[PDB]
Amino acid sequence: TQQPIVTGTSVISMKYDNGVIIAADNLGSYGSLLRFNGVERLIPVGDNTVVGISGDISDMQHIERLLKDLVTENAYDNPLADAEEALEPSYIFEYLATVMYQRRSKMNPLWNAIIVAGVQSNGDQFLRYVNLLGVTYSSPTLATGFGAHMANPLLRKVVDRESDIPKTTVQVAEEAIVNAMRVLYYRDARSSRNFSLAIIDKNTGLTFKKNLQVENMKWDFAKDIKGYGTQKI
Amino acid sequence: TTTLAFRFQGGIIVAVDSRATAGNWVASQTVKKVIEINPFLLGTMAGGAADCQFWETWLGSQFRLHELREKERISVAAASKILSNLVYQYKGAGLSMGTMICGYTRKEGPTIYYVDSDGTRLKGDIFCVGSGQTFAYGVLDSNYKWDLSVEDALYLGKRSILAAAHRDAYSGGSVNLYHVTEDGWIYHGNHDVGELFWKVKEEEGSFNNVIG
Amino acid sequence: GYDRALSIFSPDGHIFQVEYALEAVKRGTCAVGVKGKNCVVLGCERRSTLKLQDTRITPSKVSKIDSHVVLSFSGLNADSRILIEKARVEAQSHRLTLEDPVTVEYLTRYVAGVQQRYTQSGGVRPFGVSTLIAGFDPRDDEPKLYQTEPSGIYSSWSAQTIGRNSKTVREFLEKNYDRKEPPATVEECVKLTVRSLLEVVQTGAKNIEITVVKPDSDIVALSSEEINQYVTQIEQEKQE
Amino acid sequence: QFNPYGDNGGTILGIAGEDFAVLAGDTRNITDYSINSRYEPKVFDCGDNIVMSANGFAADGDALVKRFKNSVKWYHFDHNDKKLSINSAARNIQHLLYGKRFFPYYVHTIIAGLDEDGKGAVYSFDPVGSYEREQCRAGGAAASLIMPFLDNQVNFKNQYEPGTNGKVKKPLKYLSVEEVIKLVRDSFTSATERHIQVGDGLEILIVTKDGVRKEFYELKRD
Amino acid sequence: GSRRYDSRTTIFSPEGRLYQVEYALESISHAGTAIGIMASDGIVLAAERKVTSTLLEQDTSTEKLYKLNDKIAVAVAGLTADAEILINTARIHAQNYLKTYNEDIPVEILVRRLSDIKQGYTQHGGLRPFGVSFIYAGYDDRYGYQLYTSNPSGNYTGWKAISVGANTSAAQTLLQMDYKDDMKVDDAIELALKTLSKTTDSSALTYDRLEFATIRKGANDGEVYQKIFKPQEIKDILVKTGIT
Amino acid sequence: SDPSSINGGIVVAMTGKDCVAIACDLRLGSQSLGVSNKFEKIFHYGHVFLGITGLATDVTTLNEMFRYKTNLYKLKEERAIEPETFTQLVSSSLYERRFGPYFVGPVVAGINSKSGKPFIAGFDLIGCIDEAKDFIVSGTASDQLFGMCESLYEPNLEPEDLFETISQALLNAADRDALSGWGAVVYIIKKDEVVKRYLKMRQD
Amino acid sequence: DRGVSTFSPEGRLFQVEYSLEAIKLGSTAIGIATKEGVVLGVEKRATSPLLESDSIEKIVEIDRHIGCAMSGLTADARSMIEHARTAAVTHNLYYDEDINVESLTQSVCDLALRFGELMSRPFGVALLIAGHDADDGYQLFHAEPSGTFYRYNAKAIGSGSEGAQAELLNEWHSSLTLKEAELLVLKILKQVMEEKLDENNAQLSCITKQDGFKIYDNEKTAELIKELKEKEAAE
Amino acid sequence: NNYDGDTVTFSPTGRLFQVEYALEAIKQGSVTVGLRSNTHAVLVALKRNADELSSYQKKIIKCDEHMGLSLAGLAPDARVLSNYLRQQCNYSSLVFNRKLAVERAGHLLCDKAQKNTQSYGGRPYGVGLLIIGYDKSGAHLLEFQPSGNVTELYGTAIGARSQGAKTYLERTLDTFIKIDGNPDELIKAGVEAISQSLRDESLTVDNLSIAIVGKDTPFTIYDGEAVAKYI
Amino acid sequence: MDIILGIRVQDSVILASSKAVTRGISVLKDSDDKTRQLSPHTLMSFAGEAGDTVQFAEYIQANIQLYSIREDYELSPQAVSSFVRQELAKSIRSRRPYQVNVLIGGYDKKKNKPELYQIDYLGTKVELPYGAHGYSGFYTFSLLDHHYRPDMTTEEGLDLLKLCVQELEKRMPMDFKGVIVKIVDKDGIRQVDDF
Ligand SMILES: [Mg+2]
Ligand SMILES: [Mg+2]
C-alpha cells in the first residue's frame, strides 16, 4: 500500500474504421503543483501498439521498463520476432493485466490506470483498459480519470456502439479526440495544454504525434462576466 | 438460523430451519443446514455457511480415511474432535461455526457433540444453535423425555423449529428432519413452514394469537 | 544435511543394510512371547557375562508403551530406546486426539512404520532391532501378540521368539504350543515361556525375566524367586 | 488506505429448466456513477457444457472464471478427457473460492448446465464457497428486485387456484425454454427501469444436450 | 561427486556391528583407566591420567573427572575434547530440567539423554561417533546412589562397581573379586586405588598420575556433597591406604 | 493494564560499613485483590543477592533463568559469580529482550568475596544499570522509597544500624502504597554471614 | 560407490532393475479382470505355523471401487497404499465423485521414481490395482517401481509369475464369469505355491460395481477350493 | 568405463556416457514416426504391449489444443517433460493470451534436459520425444533428445528400427511435404513410413496410435477402431 | 468459564468448580466438569477462554501421562505445577496466548502432604491453603480468612466450601449452576456426587 506522488491525468482513446486513436497530456503533477511539463505518457511497443498510462509516474516508468524488457525478451531465439511472432496488443495487454492484478493481490499495487491501444495481426482494432485493481474492460471509447466523465460522453456521440466504428473515419475520430482534450483542459485542474496523440492504423501503421497543443479556445465571453450576482461594474 | 439436535431412546433427532439472510434480505429459503458427513454421521450448519459446509465435507474425508486405515467405524468422540482440533488451529482467523456432530455407534450409543469456532467441544443430550435457538429450547425443555417415541421425537424437533421460525425473523422457510440410528441416519423430509404453521395451528390449537 | 542412500538394492534384489540389521538382532539376547487364553507373557534373556550389575536401575528388557501395552526386543539396545520413545509419544497422542488408547495392532503398525521409514530414507541406517509388542485392546479380553523387524514388516503370532538361538526356542514352541488349546491360565503360560527359554538360557537364575500382561491394564513383572520356582518345578518334572 | 476491492455492478440470473438451463446477465459494467462499457460479456462458456458467471468485483470475477476454465482443462489432462459433470464442477469451484477464505473473491458465482441425468441444473455460490443446487437464482445488484418476481412467476408462490380461496395451490407446471426466456427478459426490463446499474444489453446463454447457444437483447441505455 | 570420499560412519558390517562404534571402543581401550565403585554411604570415582609430565600443572588440570551438577559427576575415558562437548550438553540438560520441574534431574534421565545423543551419531548424520565412554556417579532421592556407564554406541547400563578405558578385563575381575554389597566409601576408596595400582601400565601409582572424587552423604545432615580431590589430598589417601 | 503495577511490591537495597542490606515486601496481588503474603522477591545465587519487583511471572521466570545461568557459570568457572559480574549478566539478559522485555525492576546486592567491597546495583526493565553508592529502590512505591531513603540514609552504617534504616525505609514506603506491604523481609549481608529478618507490619 | 539414479550401459536404471529382483522373491499375487468383476488373489506364505495367517494383509482396500494386491517387500507398500487412499479420498473431496482407476494408478506410479540423493531407493514391491469406474468399466493394472503401469486382462506377479502368466495366457477369455475367474486364480495359485493351497495360506478378493471391493472370508474361499478340487477330479 | 559413474563426468575423449546410456534407452523403445506438410503435422506411433493380456503402452501425449508429442524410452520421464510442456503452454496462454510457439517449446525442453546433464546427483532423462504443433508460423515437427539437442525437421523417426522409417521419409520428402489440406493422405504417408520399421509384427487395431494437428484441426489422438481406416 | 475454588485441608485438597457453560445468551450445559486428572494423585481444575481451557488442560494431561510412562513414576505436585507454570509463562509471549487459569490440587506421596497451587494465565504461581480465580475470591476469601484452619478435616473443609458457594449463589449475578466437588488425598482422586 502506497499513495501516488507524481501523477498523470486523463488518458483518452477511441476506435475508428481502420484502427484506434489514443491521447494523453504531457503533465506530471505533484499534487496541486504542476511540476513536470515534458512527461510522455503514451509509450509505443513495436509498430502496432501504444500503451497510455495515467496515475503514478514512478510506477509508469517501471511499467515502461517492463514493456521495453518484454520486446527484448520476445526477440530472444525468435527468427520471426519482426513478423509472425512479433508482440501483439493483446499479448502486451494480458501481460500488464496479469501484473496489475497480481500486484493488487499482494496489497502493493501499481497505482495506474492503463489503456492499451493497437491493431492486431488480422487488422482487428484492440482497445482495452486495466487499472491498479486489475479491473479490465473494453469499449468503443475508453478514458481514464476525468476523461471518463468528460471525454467519453463526447466520444460516445461519435461511436455510440460497435456498428458506428466502420462509419467513423480517422479524421472524424481525431477531431473528436482533439476536441475532448480541449474540454479536459478547460475543466480538469490537473491538465496541461500540451499533449501527445497516437494513431494506430491497419494500413498506415503507427503515427505518433508529439508536442500538440490545445487551440481554438473560447475565452472572450469572460470579459462580460462581472461579480458573483448583483455587481454591475 | 435455528438448528437443534437431541438424544433419546430411539437415537438422535436432528431438526433445522432453511432460511438464509444477508441483513434483512432473505437470500434463500431452501438452504441445507444438515451436512450429511457420511451415512452414519450428521452435522448442523450455523454461523458461517461456507465454514460449516467446507469443513464438515472435509470432515467426511477424514472419517473415510480413518475407517480405511483402522478397519472400523470412527467414534462420534473422535469424529467431533477432529473438527474441534481443526477449527482450534484457525482460532483468531475469523471462522464462524456453531455445529452439532451427531452419531450413533456401538461403544458410545447415540452421541451429540456441540462444536464451536472458539474451539469449544461439548458432549450433551440437547443442543440448540442459531438466532432462534432460545425459542426452540423452550419447546424442547418443556416437552423432552428420554422415553419419547421416534414419531413423537420427530414431531418435537419439527415443532421446536416451527416455534423459532415463527418468532425469529432470521429463521423459517422449511424444516428438515433427520433421525439418527445405529445403522445410519434416516431423512424425514422437507416441511414448508408456511403450510406447517397452519396445519399445526389447527390440529394442535396453538398460536391462538395468530388469526387463521 | 547428510542425504546418503545407505539402504539400497543389490543385484540379487537384496537390501544388505536391512539384512545386516537382522544380524544385529540375531546377536541380541533372546526374547520370547507367548499368549494364553486370557494373558500374554513376555520372556527375556539376560546374558550372565555381566555380573556386578545393578538390576534395580539397569534398563529392563520389557518396556511399557502404555498402561495396557508392552514392548520387548532383541538387538541393539540404544536403537530400541528410540522406538520405545516414539511409541510412547504416539500412544499419548492417540489418546489425546481419538479419546481412546491405542490398539496393540495400531501401536505395532506405527513402530513397524517407523522401522520401514528408516530403510528408504536418506542419511539413516535401519534399526538393528526386532520387537515383540503385546497387550490387550481397550475394553477387550482377547490377547494380542505382534512381532516387528528392521525391514518394517509386522505380523500377529500365537507364540514367537526373536534374538540369539531363537531358531531353537521357536523349534520348541512349534511342537509344544497347541492353537486349539493355548495355556489356559497365567501359570501354564508363564511355565511354557520359562520352559522355552530354558532350552537356550544356560542357568535359570537371574538370566530369565518374565513379564505377565493381563486385560484392563494389569501388567506385572515377576521377581527372581517367583521365576526360580518355575525353574525348579520344570527340572524336577524333567528328572523322569 | 488501499482498497483492493471494487464494485462493477451488473446483475445475473440462472434458471434451471426440465431438460435445459439458462444463465443470463446484463452487459453493463460500471464504477460508481460512470459506465465503463455497455457491452462487457459477463457469462462465459467454460467447456464441458458448463456456463459460468462470477458477478460483483469484475477483477475477481475474471480471475475465478479463468482459474475454473483452467481447472476444466487440467481435469481433462489428468483424467483421460473425462467430461467434468456440473456437480463436480460445483464442488471444484467451492475449493477455488474457499482457497481464498481469508482474502475472498468478492463475487457471487452462478454456474449452469445439465446434470448426469440430463436435467437442468443451476448452482449458486457465496463469496467464500458455500454452494447449493437451485432451480432459480438471481445474483448481483438487482437480485432483490428479481427474486421475489421469480418466486411468484416460476414457483407460483402465494398463487392459489380461483374458487378454492387459499385451499389449493397453483400447480407447479414445467416451463419451456421459450417461457423461461420471457421471464428472464421481463426480469431484466423491470430491473433496468428501477436499478441504475442495470441496462445497455442482456446476454443469455442457453444450455441443452445439443450444446451452448447465445441470445442477445437490447436494454435501456440511460 | 562427494560420495567418493564418504567413509559411511553409520553402517552395519556383514556381522551386524557398527564399524565406527567398534573402532571407537578400540580407541577408548587405550585411554587411562577410570573406575567407579558404589557403596551404601557414597560413591567413589578414581581415574588414571595418561603418561603425564613433571611440568604439567596438576592442581589446575582436569582430564578425567567432571562435574555435571551438585549431585552428578562423570569419569571420562577417551577423547577429552569429545567428552567436553557432551559434558556441556549434559550440564544444560540438568539445568533445563531444574528450570522446568524445580527439582534436580534424576540421574538416569540425564544418563539416558546423553546416551541418546551418542546413539543419534551412530544411526544418522554421517558423522563419526564420540570416542568417549563415561562413568556416571550420581545421587537422587528416588534410587539414591547410582553408577552408570555409557559408550559410543549410546548403550548405557547400571553398575555396583565398573571400570572403563584400559585394562577393563583385568580391572573388572579384581573388582568382582573384592567387592561386597555392604561395603562402605572408605573401603571402596581403598579398592579403587588398589585396582588401579595393579592394572596400571606405569611402574608405580603416584598422586600426580591420578584424579579422584567421592560423592558422599557425608555432608552435614540429609544432603549430598561432591568432593573433587586435590593433588595433596590424593597424596594423603595413597599413604593412608598404604600404596606409597 | 500496566504490567509493572498489576502484582505490586517493592525492593530496596542499601550499603553500609563492610555490609549490604536488601529488603522487600511480601505482597502479590491481582490489582486490588491481595493474593499472597508470602511472595518473596529476593533470591540469591551463592553470595550474590537479587531482588526483583514488577510482573510476578517474570520475577519467577528471571529467578529461574539466573539460577540456571549462575549454575553453569559456576561449573565452568569453578567459582561463585561476583556481584559486579552478575550485574553485567542481568543487564545483558534483560537487553537481549529489548523489543519484548521482562516487566521487572531488578536490584543486585552483595559483597565481593575477594576485595570485600560492598556492592549494590539497580536496573530498568530493559537493562540499564544504576550503580549507586548509597541505595537502590524499585517497585510500585519507588517514589516513596526514594523519599524515605534520601532522608533516612547516611553512609557507613553498621550492620545492626543499617537494618533499622532499611526496615523503616521499606515499611513506611509500603504503608503509603496500596499494592505493597502484607509483610516484609530484610537481608543483612556481611562477607561470611547473612541474617534474614521478617518484619512485623500492618496487614492492610 | 555409485549413484542411486545411475543408468546402466544398456539404458536401464540399476536400482529399478534390482528392485524387480526383490519382487521376484515375493509371494505370488494374481489378478483376473472380467465383465462381471475383477478378482484378486494372493499367496500368504507364512514363515512359521505359529504366525497367525489372518494377520497377513497382502490384499488391501484403497476405496470402495478400488482394491489392491501386493508382492515383494510388502512393508514398502504401506506408504503407497496410504498415498492411494489419500488420492482417492482427496479427489472425491475436490470433485464429488469416484476417481478413475487409471488416474489412481497414475498417482501411485508418480511416487515410484521419486528417489535419489525424496526417498533413498525405489519401492521393492509391485502392485496389482483392480477397480471399476463408469468410463472404462472393470480394470486391472500392474504398478511397478519403474513408474510404469500396464493394464491387464489378467496378471500374475511374484515368484511364480512367469509360470502363472503362461497359464493365464491359455485360460483367460473375454467371456469369463466371476465364479470362473475365482476358481482360475485358486487353480493357478495352487500350481505355483510351494505349500498346499488352503483357505489359511491363500486369500481371495474381488471388486464388483454393486458391492464394491470385498476381501473373501476363509469360509467362503474354502468352499471355492472344494469346488475347484471336484471340478479338476471331474476329468 | 571409469567415466560413466555419473552425469557430471566427461570421458578423456570428451564424452558423457550417462547421457549416451540415456540415449540407448530410446533405441530400446518402440518406434514412433513424425512428419508434416505445410497445413498439418502427424505423429504415428507403434505401441508396445507387455504380453497378450496386457494393454498397449500409450505413446502420444497432448500438451495443448495446438501441440503434443510422441514418446520413445522411459514413459515416466515423458510424463514429466510433457507435464512441463503443458505448464509452459498454459503459462503463455494465461499470462500473454498467446499460444506457445513450437520452436520455443523445443528451447524450453532443451534447457530442462540440459540442467540434468551438468549437475551431480541427478540423471539425464531416459526418453526421446517427437513434438508436433501448429502455431502462427504454420505446421512444425521437432525431435527431442535427452542430451538436450532439439531439432526442427520435416519428418523423422525414433526408437527401435527407426532407421527404416527415417530413410523412407528421406526419399518421400518431396511428396509428403506437398500433402496440403488432406489429413488422410498425410497420415497414410506416416503409416507407410512406420511400416518400414516393422519386423515379424504388423499394424493391428490396438497396436497403432496416430495423432494430428493442423490449420483447422486441434491436436487429437486416434486409437482403436479410429485407426482401422488406415490399416 | 466462571468459578473455580480450591482448599487445602489437613490430609487432602478439595477443588470446587462450576457446572455452567454459557455461550452468550444461553446456558448450553449445566453439568460440565472443569477438571482433568494429570496423575493418580494430581488434579487440575481450570477456567478461562472457551476452547483454550480444555485444549490446555488435555495438553498438560498428555504430557504428565507421558512422563509417568517413560519413568514409571508419578511427578510430585510441585514438579507438575512448575511444568504447568512454565507452559503458561511460555504461552503469554506467544502469537496467541492460552487464556487459561488453573488450580492444581495434588497429594505428595513422598512428603505425605496435600498441596494446592494457584496459577493464572500469565504463569503466576502461588502455593496456598485456599485459592480461587476471577471474581470467586472476592466473595469467598473473607469467609476463608475467617474460618480456615490448617488442621481442618475433609468434612470441615466441605462445610466451609458450602458456605463459600452459598455466598456466591447469593451475591453473584451469574447463575453458575452449582459446583462439582472433588477430593485429592493419599488414596487418589474421588468426586463428591452430592453437593
Ligand atoms: Mg438502467
Ligand atoms: Mg488493604
Tab-separated table of N, CA, C and O in Angstrom, chain F residues 1 6 8 34 49 60 70-71 74 97 100 102 109 122-123 137 146-147 182 190 201:
chain	number	residue	atom	x	y	z
F	1	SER	N	-3.669	-3.209	33.687
F	1	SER	CA	-3.191	-2.947	32.293
F	1	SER	C	-1.675	-2.766	32.242
F	1	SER	O	-0.990	-3.452	31.482
F	6	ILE	N	0.568	-4.474	38.095
F	6	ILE	CA	-0.527	-5.432	38.284
F	6	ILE	C	-0.376	-6.149	39.625
F	6	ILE	O	-1.320	-6.219	40.414
F	8	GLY	N	2.198	-5.571	41.990
F	8	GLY	CA	2.671	-4.684	43.047
F	8	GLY	C	3.883	-5.229	43.778
F	8	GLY	O	4.338	-6.345	43.514
F	34	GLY	N	-5.636	-8.846	47.019
F	34	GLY	CA	-4.445	-9.450	47.610
F	34	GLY	C	-4.509	-10.959	47.446
F	34	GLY	O	-5.516	-11.579	47.791
F	49	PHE	N	22.994	-11.525	45.896
F	49	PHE	CA	21.551	-11.447	46.125
F	49	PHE	C	20.865	-10.614	45.051
F	49	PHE	O	21.371	-9.567	44.648
F	60	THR	N	9.504	-14.623	38.759
F	60	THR	CA	9.738	-16.058	38.883
F	60	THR	C	10.609	-16.578	37.737
F	60	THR	O	11.569	-17.319	37.967
F	70	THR	N	23.823	-18.875	36.543
F	70	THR	CA	24.863	-18.842	37.579
F	70	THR	C	25.350	-20.244	37.956
F	70	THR	O	26.475	-20.403	38.429
F	71	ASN	N	24.502	-21.251	37.757
F	71	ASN	CA	24.896	-22.642	37.983
F	71	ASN	C	25.872	-23.131	36.916
F	71	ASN	O	26.861	-23.789	37.237
F	74	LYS	N	29.213	-21.326	37.411
F	74	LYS	CA	29.997	-21.923	38.488
F	74	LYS	C	30.708	-23.211	38.064
F	74	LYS	O	31.859	-23.437	38.433
F	97	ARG	N	16.166	-9.008	25.368
F	97	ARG	CA	14.725	-8.891	25.147
F	97	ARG	C	14.323	-7.420	24.959
F	97	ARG	O	13.300	-6.978	25.479
F	100	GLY	N	10.810	-6.872	23.561
F	100	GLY	CA	9.818	-7.755	24.172
F	100	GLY	C	10.248	-8.050	25.598
F	100	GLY	O	10.450	-9.207	25.961
F	102	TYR	N	11.083	-8.239	29.804
F	102	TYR	CA	10.521	-8.657	31.076
F	102	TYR	C	10.166	-7.393	31.844
F	102	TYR	O	10.998	-6.497	31.975
F	109	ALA	N	22.487	-7.021	45.024
F	109	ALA	CA	23.164	-6.661	46.268
F	109	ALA	C	24.109	-7.779	46.697
F	109	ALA	O	23.778	-8.960	46.583
F	122	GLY	N	20.995	-1.351	40.485
F	122	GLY	CA	19.604	-1.411	40.043
F	122	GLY	C	19.527	-1.391	38.532
F	122	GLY	O	20.487	-1.017	37.861
F	123	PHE	N	18.386	-1.812	37.993
F	123	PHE	CA	18.170	-1.815	36.548
F	123	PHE	C	16.758	-1.362	36.216
F	123	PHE	O	15.837	-1.549	37.011
F	137	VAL	N	16.348	1.593	44.788
F	137	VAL	CA	14.933	1.348	45.070
F	137	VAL	C	14.226	0.834	43.824
F	137	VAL	O	14.646	1.113	42.698
F	146	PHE	N	12.342	6.389	47.487
F	146	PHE	CA	13.308	7.459	47.217
F	146	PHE	C	13.241	8.529	48.298
F	146	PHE	O	14.272	8.989	48.784
F	147	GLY	N	12.025	8.914	48.673
F	147	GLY	CA	11.816	9.896	49.732
F	147	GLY	C	12.335	9.437	51.083
F	147	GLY	O	12.998	10.197	51.788
F	182	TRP	N	1.822	-6.287	53.273
F	182	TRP	CA	1.456	-7.670	53.603
F	182	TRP	C	2.654	-8.488	54.107
F	182	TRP	O	2.782	-9.679	53.814
F	190	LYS	N	26.844	-9.721	55.369
F	190	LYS	CA	28.255	-9.479	55.663
F	190	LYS	C	29.094	-10.486	54.878
F	190	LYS	O	28.548	-11.415	54.278
F	201	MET	N	4.419	-5.838	60.365
F	201	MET	CA	3.800	-4.623	59.840
F	201	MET	C	2.290	-4.788	59.716
F	201	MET	O	1.768	-5.898	59.808
